[PDB]
Design a protein around this ligand. Structure first.
Ligand SMILES: */C=C\C(=O)Nc1cn(CCO)nc1Nc1cc(N(C)C(=O)Nc2c(Cl)c(OC)cc(OC)c2Cl)ncn1
Length: 287
């Protein structure tokens, strides 16, 4: 059981919502595509495709509290082009539905892969642009005290008009480093040393992630530290080994990666900086 308070800024009548296909039961919760009717006073007879999150029926009291949390946090953080945004919620006379934006070309990684050489092909500008947009989004969240914790291509989603949007930021978390993702990869490959070892998570480690995220981008979908089992990665990093520069990657960019991977967290750049460098570099980068 439960009753929620309703904020009318955000309440959508649940009959204005046409639920459709699901897509995986994530880290608690389960999400389904849907069509919202209205959403906009201007054009109230238009459907808008949205993603709607709701509880599975095998759902604890906390599992709920969690959903309410991340909803309320998405409210606090506010809108930005380069993040997945809240658009509404259905709170009354039914189970809770937390509606957000549909990003119609999947995750960054899938979209990169689908655009390798012999569905279109990405120019050099198209890639740096992509890194730039993620940095913007990251900067925004950071400006709002948000620390991401699992930043990587899989957690960047892409809209029809090709805009990078960061996903799963307000995320309530709690520990197997062998836990495999859908694609078969290990979340530790994105983790900064101090996050790995001493559980210390900050903007600085979100920057380390962004390093690897750049690496993913300039390998059109790469898989980090290829065939280097978890155990080995412990040492390699400890000592100071770093990933290899990709082909089709300028020294400039490879040097960014390397600063995002500074051993001393405080000496890494910040997103503010990285946005400013990526803007310049995009302007100097040819189609
Ligand atoms: C819109 C058509 C469509 O097919 N969209 C689509 C398909 N896929 C498959 C990816 O392999 N992804 C999308 N876009 C999409 C997915 C999602 N979520 C799966 C999702 O969980 N969204 C979401 C996010 Cl990202 C979030 O971030 C904090 C918070 C949410 O709810 C609280 C939700 Cl639901 N979202 C948007 N677009």
């Amino acid at each position: 059981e439960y009753e929620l308070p309703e904020d009318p800024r955000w309440e959508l009548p649940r009959d204005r919502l046409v639920l459709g296909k699901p897509l995986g039961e994530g880290a608690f919760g389960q999400v389904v595509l849907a069509e919202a009717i209205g959403l906009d006073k201007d054009k109230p007879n238009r459907v808008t495709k949205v993603a709607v999150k709701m509880l599975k029926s095998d759902a604890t009291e906390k599992d709920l509290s969690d959903l309410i949390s991340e909803m309320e946090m998405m409210k606090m953080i506010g809108k930005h082009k380069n993040i997945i945004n809240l658009l509404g919620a259905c709170t009354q006379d039914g189970p809770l539905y937390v509606i957000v934006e549909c990003a119609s070309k999947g995750n960054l990684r899938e979209y990169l892969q689908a655009r390798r050489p012999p569905e279109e092909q990405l120019s050099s500008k198209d890639l740096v642009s992509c890194a730039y947009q993620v940095a913007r989004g990251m900067e925004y969240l950071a400006s709002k005290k948000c620390i991401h914790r699992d930043l990587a291509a899989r957690n960047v989603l892409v809209t029809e008009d090709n805009v990078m949007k960061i996903a799963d930021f307000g995320l309530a978390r709690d520990i197997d480093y062998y836990k495999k993702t859908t694609n078969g990869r290990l979340p530790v490959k994105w983790m900064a040393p101090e996050a790995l070892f001493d559980r210390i998570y900050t903007h600085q480690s979100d920057v380390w992630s962004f390093g690897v995220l750049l690496w993913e981008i300039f390998t059109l979908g790469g898989s980090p530290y290829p065939g280097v089992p978890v155990e080995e990665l412990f040492k390699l990093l400890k000592e100071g080994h770093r990933m290899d520069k990709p082909s089709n990657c300028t020294n400039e960019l490879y040097m960014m990666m390397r600063d995002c991977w500074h051993a001393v967290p405080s000496q890494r750049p910040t997103f503010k900086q990285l946005v400013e460098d990526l803007d310049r570099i995009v302007a100097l980068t040819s189609n």
